[PDB]
Design a protein around this ligand. Structure first.
Ligand code: HEM
Ligand code: HEM
Ligand code: HEM
Ligand code: HEM
Ligand SMILES: O=C1NC(=O)c2c(NCCCc3ccc(O)cc3)cccc21
Ligand SMILES: O=C1NC(=O)c2c(NCCCc3ccc(O)cc3)cccc21
Ligand SMILES: O=C1NC(=O)c2c(NCCCc3ccc(O)cc3)cccc21
Ligand SMILES: O=C1NC(=O)c2c(NCCCc3ccc(O)cc3)cccc21
Ligand SMILES: O=C1NC(=O)c2c(NCCCc3ccc(O)cc3)cccc21
Ligand SMILES: O=C1NC(=O)c2c(NCCCc3ccc(O)cc3)cccc21
Ligand SMILES: O=C1NC(=O)c2c(NCCCc3ccc(O)cc3)cccc21
Ligand SMILES: [Fe+2]
Lengths: 156, 156, 156, 156, 156, 156, 156
């Protein structure tokens, strides 16, 4: 089905953000596992998987709309060097992701691609849940202290 | 069955206390969940549900006694700004609630409304159990320190 | 995640309508039960529980958006004196509620809070279902007569 | 298999009657559901389904006989404005349907299309059963009163 | 509940489209079955059933909004004479359907009938899925040859 | 029970046709199996068995009516030497069979042997189902090509 | 455990190859699904998953050896425009992958990193199995013809 050219550009921009997030979360997960913080490693693994699923749906929608999904261009991974930085890196990425999602939804609504809008809204719900998780973790570090916070994430 | 007018006023006063507690504990619960202190959130949710069940019984008794249950007047919520304050606000409310229950039981006894007394004794038992929980948490904070206490209430 | 201040105002306005509905429906339920109209009492109980669940989700959303959920202000309960009046009082409340829901969705859309919009849309679907129920009950009173209508709501 | 051209015309006439009945009974069903007369709505739904199944079998037979099933022409729906009228409308349609079934069977017998006759006979058995149901409902309205009759059809 | 007059007109237009599709898909299904292409026949039968379910929901929504669902007016069925034509006929119908759905969604959004919009969005998702299927089948005919394509659709 | 002599002659004529078909279909089945076309072989085996069952019922009816079932005279088998010809031979035999069935039914009707007619109508329904199958297979050979049609009938 | 710097460089080069393969196979998979070639799509999906699992093990090994896994640099994807090209693009990539694996194993052996060698050997066995699959599909295209080959990959 011949999609709107600018919808497809937006879907490819969101896809680009998801591909960054896949790799950043996967690397953060395996860093945390290497460090023995297995609960963080597993949670971050599931965040990466969830972004893989979003990327899949975007790829599928783009192809249906007769566009070319862009899996070649990979933007800048934000990799932290300790737990606090890694969480804040994930949050910085998520805040750019939701900004782009909102702009993509505006455009889909304007050209009446209501099915693309619905897909993007579901992804935005998932990204807002991730922002909640991240904000909560950074707040817990302040409330229980870093040493306790890390302790609570050793065992899965 | 036509009840004693002052009994009914007492029941509506206890009902008003329970209505404050429902909302205060529900809000405290959801604040704790938002902060990632999910064990406190869950426990405080169950406290709110328990007050809802008490309010239901009081409403049912007032209507049986041919009074009008007052669900319109809502007194002042005592909302804390951190875990310690929130627990102490709950305890302050409970000590007012138990005082009012004792005075209501006295009057039920005097006019021989023994069934209303038994209902209020059962509610009083639940409220004393809540006082026990609250005093215990405040003591644990002193014993284990706030950071550990909060750590212990992150996970259900 | 810092929400739009006027969105939060609207969410608190919706929450306030839900808090009225919780108490109005609960009281109506318990009145119908006291009168032996247990099918109406049970259905109205489930309507109250549904509004409790909506209020919960609104509280959770307001807190996520870093606002303060208002559980203190309780608007006017519309309590009926017989079955026809109680149903019409519920319907009057619901119509006010959907009006406020629609105006809140308009503003969510305008500021691109698409997740808040989706939550309100879901609540609106539940409120329209309640309107359907109420309009149907009122029409059935006219079709079968009040005595038959009440007969048919004695037993669960 | 090359069918008799006039058998096929008869089968298309019967199909045309079933297509009217499908839509008429489906609309009547959904009206009764909307009004809260859910027992009527469910029964009328099953009548519409039963007509759908007859139409399928007729379509299949026409194609086997190398005719063209006519799903394009839709005759006049007989829609009531209240329960008594809707039942009479169904009965009026059913009396027309059995008249046409009888004439189609006559012709099948004359040209020795005994298998089409057997199909039409089965449909006629179903349509007479619907007449029995309809005559019975109209008779019950007289015996129990319209208000009682409607009351008995509120709940499934 | 009193719905918007033009919303109801849009909903009747969509319903009118679904009524055409039900009959077109059902006939195409039974033609394919008659020809021994039973996998196409079965798939097309499920397409017709899906349209029936959409029509049901539209009728229910129109009646709730106090409109009259129009099951009398049946537009032009697009019937093919071979498999390629039948698939293209279905696709031509679906493209008219999605244009009308998008225009209906615009109007629901403008009068704030967000529940009707959500229903139409769900139907639109189903229609785009059908378009995907149709475009894919037409493409497969080119990639594998017509004879192979039909061979692969003989057996369910 | 003393049957009509000409009915019994008609029943023996139908029996004779069934006896031809048993052997023709059984040989065709075993030819197809020998050629590796096992799906045709299995389907044709089941056609032969069904004919065996009809012959059994005809034998039983003739004896009940105090006639002598003729199993001695075997008419001409129509044996094909390739798939398309075998199917055509089965179809040719079936078209002779249904012509005889219709004339037999006419006579049963005339002399009021309604039970014999019902038996013959059932047999006729089975033979028209075989005609449907055969016409469909011949149609498929044209639509998918002989080589594909055969390919699709190698395996069960 | 401090690893050999040149081993880690080899592991990151293999990881780079796996990352190209993840995205190339995933895009090819979803292209094939879009075209209705679901068997190819599912198989290619499983190939992508397998490369993801290899990349995971490489990331984990690099981190254990105190290196930095490179998920930032994504090499050139080889995307085909039809089935034949897509298979050949996969084969061209795999043949570069096995050349790099062999050179990395040589270096692991020389520096006595026998565990990294064993990992790479296991990955090589997987890549040789992928080469077998690809060479086999290309051979089948010649043996059965492209139309049949694609037909055989329509359905799962
Ligand atoms: C375009 C990029 C990618 C896409 C679209 C993608 C997609 C997927 C999908 C759809 C799944 C299955 C999820 C499920 O249903 O449970 C999955 C699983 C997985 N992915 Fe990815 N992925 C990508 C990149 C990666 C990368 C770069 C890695 C590792 C460095 C990776 C590691 C994994 C792992 C370990 C699994 C679990 C497989 C299993 O054990 O079953 N993925 N991926
Ligand atoms: C007049 C005030 C209220 C009354 C009398 C009341 C009563 C009840 C009762 C009897 C139950 C069922 C408990 C059980 O047996 O498990 C219940 C459940 C519940 N209530 Fe309330 N309630 C009130 C106010 C509220 C408020 C203000 C909220 C939230 C803001 C709320 C949220 C809930 C929730 C979430 C549930 C559980 C529902 C479920 O998932 O099953 N209630 N309430
Ligand atoms: C040519 C006209 C139609 C034909 C031949 C037809 C045929 C059928 C058939 C064969 C079934 C399956 C019944 C069973 O065995 O359970 C069915 C189901 C159904 N039909 Fe129709 N139908 C037609 C029109 C309609 C219309 C106009 C509507 C609604 C306005 C409708 C609504 C339904 C529904 C709701 C179902 C059941 C779906 C489910 O399984 O949930 N049909 N139809
Ligand atoms: C007078 C002619 C025949 C009659 C009335 C007849 C009747 C029957 C009947 C009633 C059955 C049981 C069917 C069932 O209920 O499943 C049967 C089975 C069978 N018939 Fe015949 N048959 C006749 C001739 C033949 C011939 C000529 C052959 C082969 C050359 C044959 C081969 C078979 C086979 C293989 C079975 C399956 C037996 C088993 O494995 O259980 N029949 N027949
Ligand atoms: O919070 C409230 N509790 C109440 O009862 C109430 C109202 N009552 C109207 C009379 C309801 C009534 C009538 C007959 C009967 O037998 C029992 C009760 C009105 C506004 C607010 C409230
Ligand atoms: O009904 C009410 N809703 C409220 O939020 C409230 C009050 N809030 C004090 C601050 C509560 C707070 C503080 C920090 C935070 O991160 C989130 C929340 C006080 C009285 C009555 C109400
Ligand atoms: O309602 C309708 N029934 C029909 O058959 C039809 C049309 N037929 C085109 C020929 C379709 C055809 C071709 C070959 C075949 O073997 C069987 C059928 C066209 C418009 C509307 C209708
Ligand atoms: O296709 C059609 N849809 C319709 O509604 C209709 C007719 N309506 C009669 C009024 C039916 C009515 C009455 C009261 C009510 O509360 C809701 C509905 C008449 C002919 C054909 C059609
Ligand atoms: O193929 C044949 N069918 C027959 O019936 C038959 C013969 N009949 C002898 C009498 C068999 C009989 C006797 C008494 C009775 O109550 C019923 C039947 C002889 C040769 C060939 C055939
Ligand atoms: O793709 C990438 N892989 C990486 O490692 C990386 C970066 N490294 C930050 C250091 C992260 C680190 C710190 C301590 C430690 O013990 C292990 C690792 C930065 C940008 C991109 C990439
Ligand atoms: O990252 C990438 N996404 C792509 O689509 C792509 C390339 N496409 C070649 C055409 C692929 C194609 C051809 C026909 C068709 O109907 C649909 C798609 C090439 C390099 C990198 C990328
Ligand atoms: Fe600790």
């Amino acid at each position: 089905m011949k999609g709107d050219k600018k919808v497809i550009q937006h879907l490819n921009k969101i896809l680009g953000n998801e591909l960054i997030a896949i790799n950043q979360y996967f690397l953060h997960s395996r860093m945390w596992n290497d460090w023995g913080l297995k609960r963080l490693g597993a949670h971050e693994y599931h965040e990466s998987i969830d972004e893989m699923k979003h990327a899949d749906k975007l790829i599928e929608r783009i192809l249906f709309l007769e566009g070319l999904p862009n899996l070649q261009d990979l933007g800048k991974l934000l990799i932290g060097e300790n737990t606090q930085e890694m969480l804040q890196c994930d949050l910085n990425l998520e805040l750019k992701a939701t900004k782009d999602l909102r702009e993509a939804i505006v455009h889909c609504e304007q050209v009446h691609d209501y099915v693309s809008r619905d897909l993007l809204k579901d992804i935005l719900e998932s990204e807002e849940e991730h922002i909640d998780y991240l904000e909560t973790q950074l707040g817990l570090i302040q409330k229980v202290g870093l040493e306790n916070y890390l302790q609570s994430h050793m065992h899965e």
